[PDB]
């Protein structure tokens, strides 16, 4: 039940282990039945800001005149 993800290496050691292998991976295993007990995975996604930045009914191009 182990989950193996890879790390985003910031500072690199003068090793090939700093660039590949299990040496740039980390392992995770959940010990509790309730999902609330789990830690945060932090592999979180993003989205389009459009719902806030452009909640416009009739879609407009920036090059084209906004007021038409």
């Amino acid at each position: 039940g182990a989950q193996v993800s890879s790390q985003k290496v910031g500072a690199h050691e003068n090793s090939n282990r700093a660039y590949g292998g299990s040496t740039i991976n980390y392992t995770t295993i959940n010990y509790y039945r309730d999902s609330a007990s789990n830690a945060a995975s932090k592999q979180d996604f993003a989205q389009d800001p459009s719902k806030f930045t452009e909640p416009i009914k009739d879609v407009l191009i920036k090059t084209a005149p906004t007021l038409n």
């Binding site: 985003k8 509790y32 309730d34 999902s35 609330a36 007990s37 789990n38 830690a39 945060a40 932090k42 592999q43 979180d44 996604f45 993003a46 806030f52 930045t53 452009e54 909640p55 416009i56 407009l60 920036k62 090059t63 084209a64 005149p65 906004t66 007021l67």
Partner: protein, 272 residues
Amino acid sequence: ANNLPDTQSSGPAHSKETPALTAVETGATNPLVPSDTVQTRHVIQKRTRSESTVESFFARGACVAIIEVDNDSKLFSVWKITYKDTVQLRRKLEFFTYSRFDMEFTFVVTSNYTDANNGHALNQVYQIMYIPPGAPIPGKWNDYTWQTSSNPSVFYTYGAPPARISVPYVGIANAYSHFYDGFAKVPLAGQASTEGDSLYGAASLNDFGSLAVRVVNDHNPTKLTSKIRVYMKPKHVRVWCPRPPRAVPYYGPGVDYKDGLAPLPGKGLTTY
């Protein structure tokens, strides 16, 4: 939590396309990038927004309460669960209207002799009992309620690493409301003014219940005080409807204000 787009090189322009001109009346923000108004070079973007994700923004244990017990009714204390007793976490949560997450509670317990040269006591054990709205609240530091046959309790031994427990999403709605524009009651026509009156913006009189804390050891005449600092961290976070942050000092559980109403300093219009 990802990458940002590269800057593409952009040369001069002489066209009928004018991205610089717009009309903010529509309610939209002009999605311009540097290459729209100036000549740019190609830049391979390596910066990411990994730390500004909703999760990383809240992934910190914030203090929400400091419960105090004097082991010489103060032999036990009760804290009504809330995030509004402090200001820092509260302000961050209020960037959004609704939220849904799990909670991690860490308890930092400290104690000391009030007297520099008097008294002595053996190591203390604390009991932190959660009293869900409806359960009997302790009247004495040692009455039957402390049997916890159903209420969740945490027994902490002084000096041990801070205690910590996780709580699931416990709301009775599909999300926690940071703002509730309403009442719990509707006054009906004909009833006395004393009737149907309730607080504005309040839901249940007892939303999440409270914590009852006490020292389990038999109290000695020695003067001692303990403080349990409660730290809470939202994990597995989802939030809805952004709102402008609090600009003036908080004045209670509501959006009420009173004191620091002039937050901005003076600065000359033409002064850099």
